[PDB]
DNA sequence: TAGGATTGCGCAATAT
DNA sequence: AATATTGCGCAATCCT
């Protein structure tokens, strides 16, 4: 009986729960997408560092010639 | 009018559309989670390379400095 | 004006 | 008893 207050409070609470559950899942997914952007940027930064370090090593080694 | 045969057909088509769009987003999420695992293993490889080269360069510079 | 894609929400069965 | 999760569906809105 959807007319009983018992039903109403039940729907009211579950609607809050469903929206909360759905918000949490959407947050977890957005974070995941952000971790990709972040890792991507950090890997780019490290590759640049690898290249710089290699240039520094070549330059010092040329000092032997 | 929700009794219209036109209405029922429109609902059926949108229900198919909704499932397809949800499937697609769920797949996209799964692909994104995999990319994180992949980018993480690459990040570990790069960190190791940077550490290795950094030690190699520190050693070489120290040799030149001890002249 | 038509029609699929996207998304948030409600309901209720089901799970914890 | 109560919250959390989710399949199905309605509908508003976005996008072609």
Curated annotation (Swiss-Prot), chain B:
Binds DNA as a homodimer and as a heterodimer. Interacts with ATF4. Binds DNA as a heterodimer with ATF4. Interacts with MYB; within the complex, MYB and CEBPB bind to different promoter regions. Can form stable heterodimers with CEBPD. Can form stable heterodimers with CEBPA and CEBPE. Interacts with SIX1. Isoform 2 and isoform 3 also form heterodimers. Interacts with TRIM28 and PTGES2. Interacts with PRDM16. Interacts with CCDC85B. Forms a complex with THOC5. Interacts with ZNF638; this interaction increases transcriptional activation. Disulfide bonds: none annotated. Expressed at low levels in the lung, kidney and spleen. It comes from Homo sapiens (Human). This is CCAAT/enhancer-binding protein beta. The modification Phosphoserine is found at residues 21, 58. Residues 4-67 form the bZIP domain. It is found in: Nucleus; Cytoplasm. Important transcription factor regulating the expression of genes involved in immune and inflammatory responses. Also plays a significant role in adipogenesis, as well as in the gluconeogenic pathway, liver regeneration, and hematopoiesis. The consensus recognition site is 5'-T[TG]NNGNAA[TG]-3'. Its functional capacity is governed by protein interactions and post-translational protein modifications. During early embryogenesis, plays essential and redundant roles with CEBPA. There is a cross-link at residue 65 (Glycyl lysine isopeptide (Lys-Gly) (interchain with G-Cter in SUMO2)). Residues 8-28 are annotated as: Basic motif.
């Amino acid at each position: 009986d959807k007319h009983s207050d018992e039903y109403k409070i039940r729907r009211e609470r579950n609607n809050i729960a469903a929206r909360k559950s759905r918000d949490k899942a959407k947050m977890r997914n957005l974070e995941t997408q952000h971790k990709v952007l972040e890792l991507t940027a950090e890997n780019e930064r490290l590759q640049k560092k690898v290249e710089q370090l290699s240039r520094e090593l070549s330059t010092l080694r040329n000092l032997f010639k």
